Amino acid sequence: QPQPDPVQEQLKQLAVEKAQLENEELRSKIRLNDAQAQKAMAERDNKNLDYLEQE
Amino acid sequence: QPQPDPVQEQLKQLAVEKAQLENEELRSKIRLNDAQAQKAMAERDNKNLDY
C-alpha cells in the first residue's frame, strides 16, 4: 500500500483555492470596470448639461 | 472501469469558468473605453463653444 505525503495533498488543496480566488478576482475587476463606466457616463451628462446652459 | 479523480473535474470546471469570465472582462473594457470616448466628445464640444 503506498504511503501518503501530506505536503502534496495540502499543496493541491491550496492550488484549487488559488484558482477559485483568481475567478473571484476577475469578477472584482469586471465590477470595477463597469463602475468606472457609469462614473464617466455621469460626468459626460453633467458636461452636456453645462454646454446647454452656457449656449 | 476507470476510477474518476474528483480533483481533475473541479479543475476543468474552474478552467471553464475562467474562460467564461474573460469574455465579460473584455466587454467591460469595451464599455469603459466607449464611455471615455464619449466624455472626450462632450469636453471637446464644450471647448469649441468656449472658443
Which value, to the nearest 10 degrees, does the dihedral of the CA atoms of residues A10, A11, A15, A20 take?
A: 20
Exp. method = cryo-EM
- CB–CB contact A19 B21 (8 Å): no
Cell of A51: 454646454
Distance from CA of A25 to the nearest CA of B (A): 10
| B3: amino acid identity, one letter | Q
| A20: amino acid identity, one letter | Q
Distance (Å) of CA A51 to CA A40, A41, A42, A45, B41: 17, 15, 14, 10, 12
Cell of A32: 470595477
Helices A6-54, B6-50: axis angle to 10 degrees equals 20
| C-alpha–C-alpha distance, residues A11 and B26, integer Å | 32
**Resolution in units of Å:** 4.0
Q: Do A45 and B43 contact (CB within 8 A), yes or no? A: no
| C-alpha–C-alpha distance, residues B38 and B32, integer Å | 10
Rg (CA), chain B: 23
Q: Which residue in B30, B45, B35 sits closest to A39, CA to CA?
A: B35
Whether residue B13 lies within 8 A of chain A, CB to CB, comes out as no
CB contacts of B38 in chain A (<8 Å) are 40-41, 44
